[PDB]
Design a protein around this ligand. Structure first.
Ligand SMILES: [Zn+2]
Ligand SMILES: [Zn+2]
Lengths: 588, 409, 624
């Protein structure tokens, strides 16, 4: 029975699974919009350092934020291992997050760098589908899925109990994405991350179509198109598509982008280059991903509101200075485009200002007047409406847990579970933050069958009998696991107990022994025919398991018939023991 | 006695009875009964006697054995069963309609090398006859699309599904179950596999998908106006295979179609690379299609002139495609005659070069479009008449005959 | 009812084509043909000169078997293939793959006879094998001369007449070509398989890779049932440790330990051979002309590449560039660049531009490294040959090394140093023996040296280890043991010996799932009952508790009479015999005799007392 004690339902999902006396914290996350209240993870439910599996989901801090920062308090040298691609992107992302947020006199964050260095180089990498040797009776296998080019789900198998923790799985990939694989393992606990439940996902072609037409409309009015995104996230498809657009239209626009330590981004993207699709692998000789043109400018300080310019800010929702300080000039102009390639929670500043806050301050009583054409697309590449139902229909789950949803949209997410009630109706309980939801699991014990059980395969096939397949081979449980049919008598040191039930029936007849012998012989061929009985030369009969002889006669009017049957067919003899009791026939 | 000995004996019996005799009177029926009565206990001869009874056709009337064996133990015997039943199919044998119900238990098998044949089974049982049952009309297509939607889970079971749907589309093809398939959100059909089966995995399934698409567009005259967009926007695939296949599927559907703004996404396949063997196919495609307005005609003309001035080694294909374009729709170039050739209303100067491979193309295009035009020479220049007189008498396979007042006959 | 038996059709020691069968798995190991065999024919070259055309006439009016120093065939090299006849390919489900080497004969068994199943392997090995077959067919199809050697294959009564080294091998079925059809129509069947996966083929047997460290993807697949440890070994090395070195944390209680790859050269020293090769290349670049090193495509040559790169800090000055002639050279380079996860844990795979396997090849590419992955008009910029050229080739007859050897055939100016020891001395240089070159044969190969397999067998403590070939005898031209130590007995394999060394008697599967039943008490064997209706689904008879046991045990007469009295019976008279006991009950005149392992009851016509006595006597023993 697994516990699956969740820790969040809208953002910073840091749920943990407690099963088989093993507690595993998967993707320990932390909030990014707080002030000395939710900067780190909610570690108030545990005050120890006993974990079974510490696995993160993907690169950016929406699901893996505290596992790299709060490691100073709870430092473990065991299951803290992660996958392979999470070794070069994590250091640079935490570095830029520190120099962006922690460098502005934050409340509490990673001050020293030595602790970061050791908790990063202490991690052991995991290859593709590499089952890392856990402590005992546990295995962790990572499948493939294209979400951030390096994201993957992990399956923890602890004593016939497999739980799959998938981080933002999505379908319908593109050039900078891959296809999700499930391996068809048929698990029992499916903790999924549902973000777009009711909103149906449209095709990507019309998405790029509307993006290019709105970019053309913004460039026609000499508007500054400032697109905000993560440092190394879902912006690679954006820059590659705008590059293809620029080379197709042959324009001389600026098309600048933030540095964000670009001296190693292309190197890390082209070195491994394994967590991608085939469209880049077949043509690795043309440098389709890296080595691009018209996108080698830095929009950090050379971004002035003078003409039409395309800028790329390294911020999800204008965290500290990327899309807030360097993009504050192009916010009050009537001709200014601010494309958002992500959909965060309703707690940041830019997301709240775009949703319903047409006039709101930035930090403290700042300029609230902002009139533009800010419109966010669906380029977040998160769990779509079709992928979730395809997965729950192809996996056949027994319990669906919804994690990392929203505040109000989660109220509709459970409504989507109602649709599952028509296809995958099961114990689908959406646990809230810090609300554990246990589940009942089967036993799935372990036994050991000998070769005699193979004989049961002979009578099962090429036969019409039912309800009788393996009615033998009684259990022989001991310190070890072993069952047998006749070898139990050999291993316990004893022989077959000779049991022979014998009775002396009396018949009322004054005729000769041969006459009554032929009579009982002809009578045994009338009520039952599946039993074979032969006649002995002395004048007796014998069933294949029962023998009928004539004892010493006497009053000669009564004849004494000795019946004997072995215990193996004792009950059958009991049936025989019934027939002589329904009287003697009236035909002779 | 042994496991392989029985299989070898059965193979010898099949080679000695199903290769030479192939007749009745204890030549194909006795061996089948002997193989059926020679059952085993655990994967001994089942996979062998299945194809034994498969290659021995008793008579045109033996399906109960495979029907009850379809639920055997080893899933690798179901493959032998399905290949044997396909061998019985390709010889007729009056396949019943009940197998389709059993085929349902073949849709959810949780195994490989079975669903790739299960889609073929549902296709053949739907293509046999859509009677004796809604009524097998656009019903098995939904199951085929549902099985093909999981293309990322198997690279072999998705191409076979599309290849089977290519011929399954020859059914009644109800619009209620066909128009909703071309969209993500379904409007009984509750699946996709049309807009989600292209950009999912390697192109070996994309080829089968576009093959099924052109196969269903050739038979049904409809459905083309809503799939031409999808057939055009799949050109930026950076694969040398999908491009020529797109040219082929567009050439095979070049009828009752329009082209207003989707030309730029299908013509740019000649500038990205050389494509020596694809250029002739693209030129044959561009000439058999129809253009809505004159802007597309002008774009195609300037692009062909660019290809000529950049690659003058294939001028014959350019002249032939321009001839076909002028013979298809000559009216669409009528408002463009004084714009192609440099003419002045009161100067009549700037005579172009005679042997210029850039002006002869426009000349032959105008001459080919001058067939059914009411007043073509009303906008001609002075040297155009002598150019036509010289080109017509020199070659006749590209310049047709006209009724100019200056010429005779 | 069968057992596991390896049916090997080959007698090659480096490669292997074994097939370890099972009860229901029917698995097959890697299959490879004879790669070093097609060398006695004339080398495939373009622009045929006059020196390799006019030679000695044939023997006894053949006109198809020329002779110049030795015997040669002026026709297609006629690639070899194993027999593979006494096993039909219609009952095969999967074929195993080795470290980018065992697919030269793969397309010959996919779309020819059978093998309609699936196939499991990893990405780097299959990609390198694809590039190898591509360069092989590219070197074959250039100048595709017709086959003119279909006369000496038959009539073997006169095949023993010519000189030795030609009649030692027989001809059964040789294909000589690929037609560029099965090679690319058979590669679209491989599945994504990593390391230590849970594919669970056939629902009963499981395979687990090991990823030994020899090259890029030297995986040793371990096929194993519920209780079985069949271990197959393709290639391993314990000295390089760069490409994920081999680990012995899983193959402890192995069963057969099929060892295939060996070193075959125990006298040479890797460090010493690299040092002498460096000295030789230095002394031949100091004076003379160009340098030619005929090597294989991407793979083993990377250590030599790294050594020649690090040798730039020696007496050898600059202006000694490296040419690489191969049609798949750029593809191999980019594949080595992209493949970095299959390296060591932390020694090589550091990801900070310090892969130490392929990144060092591109780090020095900016100083002096011109690739030029072709020969068709690419050296027109500068032609002086103050360099060293490496040409990939399957053997010494297909690659472009023969054109370069015929180019500067003059001696005392070039080197013919090789890198692969899977050849010979008098036959490899048979058409080129009229020369005066040094003919150095530095054997770059590290495959499970005899000093390593010894300690491996010591730390494994194995049993019933099978020997691949008949090399249990001392090799010729050597004076040493060079054998393997076995405790039980040394086995033997040959061309057609299907020896049976296995006995899996369905050890323990039991398909245990939802088993709830009572448990009796005993000394050490708490026996219990069982349930029928197994209802097996897929290689598992999940006999769950849902909808006849025999008896055993002596019944004491003392406890019998005690329970008779305290249940309600009376007037019971018991007497003794020589060994047994006779008890009489006056009601219904019941006479019961109990002897050692014997009981017999006799009574009159009565049913209720009969069943009562039955249930009273049956609860005095344990049910089995
Ligand atoms: Zn997320
Ligand atoms: Zn994410």
């Amino acid at each position: 029975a697994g516990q699956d004690v969740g820790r969040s339902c809208i953002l910073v999902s840091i749920a943990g699974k407690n099963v088989m006396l093993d507690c595993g914290m998967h993707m320990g996350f932390n909030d990014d919009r707080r002030f000395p209240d939710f900067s780190y993870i909610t570690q108030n439910g545990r005050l120890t350092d006993f974990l079974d599996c510490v696995i993160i989901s993907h690169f950016h801090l929406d699901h893996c934020g505290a596992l790299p920062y709060f490691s100073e308090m709870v430092g473990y040298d065991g299951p803290i291992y992660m996958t392979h691609p999470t070794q070069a992107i994590c250091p640079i992302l935490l570095e830029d997050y520190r120099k962006i947020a922690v460098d502005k006199k934050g409340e509490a964050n990673f001050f020293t760098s030595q602790m970061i260095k050791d908790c990063m180089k202490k991690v052991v990498a995991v290859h593709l589908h590499q089952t890392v040797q856990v402590d005992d009776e546990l295995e962790i296998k990572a499948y493939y899925a294209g979400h951030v080019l390096g994201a993957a789900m992990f399956q923890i198998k602890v004593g016939s109990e497999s739980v799959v923790y998938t981080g933002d799985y999505n379908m319908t990939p593109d050039r900078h994405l891959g296809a999700a694989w499930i391996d068809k393992c048929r698990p029992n606990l499916l903790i999924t991350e549902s973000t777009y439940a009711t909103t149906i996902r449209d095709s990507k072609r019309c998405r790029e179509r509307d993006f290019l037409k709105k970019v053309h409309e913004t460039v026609e009015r000499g508007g500054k198109v400032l697109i905000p995104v993560f440092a190394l996230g879902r912006a690679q498809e954006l820059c590659i598509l705008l590059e293809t657009f620029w080379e197709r239209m042959n324009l001389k626009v600026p098309i600048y982008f933030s540095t964000g330590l670009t001296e190693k981004a292309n190197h890390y993207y082209k070195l491994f280059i394994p967590w991608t699709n085939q469209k880049i692998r077949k043509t690795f000789v043309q440098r389709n991903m890296f080595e691009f043109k018209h996108i080698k400018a830095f929009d950090r300080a050379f971004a002035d509101n003078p003409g039409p310019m395309v800028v790329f800010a390294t911020p999800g929702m204008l965290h500290a200075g990327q899309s807030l300080q360097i993009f504050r000039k192009w916010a009050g102009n009537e001709k200014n485009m601010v494309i958002m390639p992500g959909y965060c929670v309703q707690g940041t500043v830019g997301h709240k200002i775009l949703s319903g806050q047409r006039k709101l301050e930035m930090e403290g009583r700042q300029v609230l007047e902002v009139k533009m054409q800010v419109e966010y697309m669906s380029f977040s590449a998160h769990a779509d409406a079709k992928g979730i139902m395809q997965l729950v229909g192809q996996a056949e789950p027994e319990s669906v847990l919804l994690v990392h949803g929203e505040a109000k949209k989660m109220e509709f997410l459970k409504q989507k579970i109602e649709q599952e009630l028509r296809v995958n109706c099961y114990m689908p309980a959406n646990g809230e933050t810090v609300t554990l939801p246990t589940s009942p699991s089967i036993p799935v014990g372990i036994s050991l069958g000998l070769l005699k059980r193979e004989m049961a395969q002979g009578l099962l096939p090429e036969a019409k009998k039912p309800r009788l397949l393996h009615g033998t081979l009684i259990m022989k449980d001991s310190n070890f696991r072993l069952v047998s049919s006749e070898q139990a008598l050999k291993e316990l040191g004893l022989a077959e107990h000779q049991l022979r039930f014998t009775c002396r029936v009396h018949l009322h007849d004054t005729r000769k022994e041969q006459e009554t012998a032929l009579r009982v012989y002809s009578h045994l061929k009338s009520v039952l025919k599946d039993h074979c009985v032969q006649h002995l030369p002395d004048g007796s009969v014998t069933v294949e398991s029962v023998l009928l002889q004539a004892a010493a006669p006497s009053d000669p009017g009564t004849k004494v018939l000795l019946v004997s049957w072995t215990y193996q067919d004792e009950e059958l003899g009991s049936f025989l023991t019934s027939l002589l009791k329904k009287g003697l026939p009236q035909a002779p | 006695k042994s496991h392989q000995v029985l299989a070898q004996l059965l193979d010898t019996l099949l080679a000695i009875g199903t290769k030479l005799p192939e007749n009745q009177a204890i030549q194909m029926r006795l061996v089948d009964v002997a193989c059926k009565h020679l059952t085993d206990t655990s994967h001994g001869v089942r996979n062998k006697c299945l194809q034994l009874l498969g290659n021995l056709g008793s008579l045109e009337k033996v399906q109960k054995i495979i029907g009850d064996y379809f639920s055997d133990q080893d899933p690798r015997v179901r493959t032998a069963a399905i290949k044997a039943m396909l061998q019985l199919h390709e010889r007729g044998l009056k396949l019943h309609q009940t197998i389709y119900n059993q085929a349902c238990k073949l849709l959810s098998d949780d195994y490989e090398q079975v669903r790739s044949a299960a889609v073929q089974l549902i296709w053949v049982v739907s293509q046999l006859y859509p009677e004796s049952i809604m009524v097998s009309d656009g019903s098995w297509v939904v199951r085929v699309q549902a099985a093909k939607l999981l293309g990322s889970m198997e690279q072999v079971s998705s191409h076979f599904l599309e290849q089977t749907l290519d011929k399954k589309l020859m059914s009644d093809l109800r619009r209620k179950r066909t128009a909703h398939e071309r969209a993500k959100e379904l409007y009984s059909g509750a699946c996709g596999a049309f807009v989600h089966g292209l950009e999912d995995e390697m192109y070996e399934v994309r080829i089968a998908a576009v093959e099924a698409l052109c196969m269903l567009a050739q038979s049904s005259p409809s459905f083309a106006e809503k799939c031409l967009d999808f057939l055009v926007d799949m050109f930026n695939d950076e694969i040398e295979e999908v491009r020529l296949q797109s040219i082929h599927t567009m050439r095979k559907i070049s009828n009752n179609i329009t082209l207003r703004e989707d030309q730029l996404d299908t013509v740019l396949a000649v500038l990205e690379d050389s494509s020596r063997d694809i250029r002739e196919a693209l030129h044959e495609l561009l000439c058999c299609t129809n253009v809505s307005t004159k802007e597309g005609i002008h774009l195609a003309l300037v692009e062909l002139l660019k290809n000529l001035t950049k690659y003058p080694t294939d001028r014959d294909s350019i002249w032939k495609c321009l001839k076909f374009l002028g013979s298809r729709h000559p009216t669409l170039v009528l408002p463009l005659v004084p714009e192609l050739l440099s003419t002045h209303p009161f100067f009549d100067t700037a005579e172009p070069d005679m042997d210029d491979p850039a002006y002869i193309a426009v000349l032959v295009l105008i001459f080919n479009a001058a067939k059914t035009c009411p007043t073509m020479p009303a906008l001609f220049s002075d040297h155009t008449f002598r150019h036509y007189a010289y080109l017509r008498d020199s070659l006749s396979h590209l310049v047709p005959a006209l009724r100019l007042p200056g010429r005779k006959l | 009812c069968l057992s596991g038996h390896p049916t090997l059709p080959c007698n090659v020691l480096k490669f292997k084509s074994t097939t370890i069968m099972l009860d229901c798995g029917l698995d097959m190991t890697s299959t490879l043909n004879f790669l070093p065999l097609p060398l006695v024919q004339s080398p495939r070259l373009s622009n045929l000169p006059g020196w390799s055309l006019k030679d000695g006439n044939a023997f006894l009016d053949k006109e198809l078997k020329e002779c110049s120093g030795h015997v040669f065939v002026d026709s297609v090299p006629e690639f070899c293939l194993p027999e593979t006849e006494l096993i039909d390919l219609s009952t095969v489900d999967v074929i195993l793959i080795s470290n980018y080497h065992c697919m030269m004969a793969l397309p010959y068994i996919t779309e020819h006879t059978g093998f309609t199943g699936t196939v499991y392997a990893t990405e780097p090995t299959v990609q390198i094998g694809r590039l190898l077959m591509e360069e092989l067919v590219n070197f074959i199809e250039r100048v595709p001369k017709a086959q003119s050697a279909s006369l000496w294959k038959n009539k073997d009564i006169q095949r023993l007449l010519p000189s030795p080294l030609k009649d030692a091998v027989e001809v059964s079925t040789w294909r000589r070509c690929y037609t560029m059809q099965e090679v690319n129509s058979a590669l679209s069947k491989i599945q994504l398989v990593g390391y230590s996966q849970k594919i669970e083929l056939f629902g009963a047997v499981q395979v687990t890779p090991l990823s030994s460290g020899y090259a890029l993807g030297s995986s040793n697949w371990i096929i194993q049932s519920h209780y079985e440890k069949v271990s197959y070994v393709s290639g391993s090395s314990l000295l390089t440790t760069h490409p994920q070195p081999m680990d012995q944390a899983s193959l402890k209680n192995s069963d057969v330990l099929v060892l295939t790859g060996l070193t075959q050269i125990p006298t040479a020293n890797p460090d010493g051979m690299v040092g002498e090769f460096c000295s030789n290349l230095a002394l031949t670049v100091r004076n003379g002309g160009n340098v030619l090193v005929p090597c294989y495509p991407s793979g083993v040559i990377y250590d030599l590449l790294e050594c020649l790169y690090q040798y730039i800090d020696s007496a050898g000055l600059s202006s000694v560039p490296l040419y690489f002639i191969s049609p798949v050279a750029n593809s191999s380079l980019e594949f080595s660049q992209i493949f970095a996860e299959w390296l060591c844990h932390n020694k090589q795979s550091k990801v900070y531009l310090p892969e130490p396997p392929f990144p060092h090849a591109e780090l020095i590419q900016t100083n002096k490294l011109k690739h030029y992955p072709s020969i068709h008009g690419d050296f027109s910029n500068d032609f002086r040959q103050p360099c060293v050229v490496f040409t990939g080739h399957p053997s010494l007859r297909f690659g472009d090394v023969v054109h370069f050897m015929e180019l500067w055939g003059k001696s005392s100016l070039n080197t013919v140093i090789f890198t692969e020891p899977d050849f010979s001395y008098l036959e490899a240089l048979a058409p080129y023996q009229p020369l005066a070159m040094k003919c150095i044969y530095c054997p770059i190969d590290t495959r499970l040296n005899f000093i390593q397999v010894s300690k491996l067998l010591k730390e494994v403590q194995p049993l019933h280890v099978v020997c691949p070939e008949q090399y249990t005898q001392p090799p010729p031209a050597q004076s040493h043991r060079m054998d393997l130590m076995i405790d039980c007995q040394p086995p033997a394999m040959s061309y057609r010996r299907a020896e049976v060394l296995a006995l899996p008697f369905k050890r323990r599967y039991e398909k245990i799932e939802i088993m709830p039943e009572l448990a009796d008490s005993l000394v050490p064997m708490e026996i219990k009952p069982g349930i029928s209706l197994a209802t097996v689904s897929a290689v598992l008879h999940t006999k769950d508790n849902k909808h006849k046991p025999l008896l055993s045990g002596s019944i004491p007469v003392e406890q019998f009479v005690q329970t008779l009295e305290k249940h309600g019976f009376s007037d019971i008279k018991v007497e003794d015999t020589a060994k047994g006991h006779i008890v009489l009950l006056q009601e219904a005149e019941t006479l019961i005799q109990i002897e050692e392992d014997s009981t017999h009851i006799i009574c009159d016509n009565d049913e209720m007392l009969r069943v009562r006595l039955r249930d009273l006597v049956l609860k005095f023993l344990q049910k089995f």
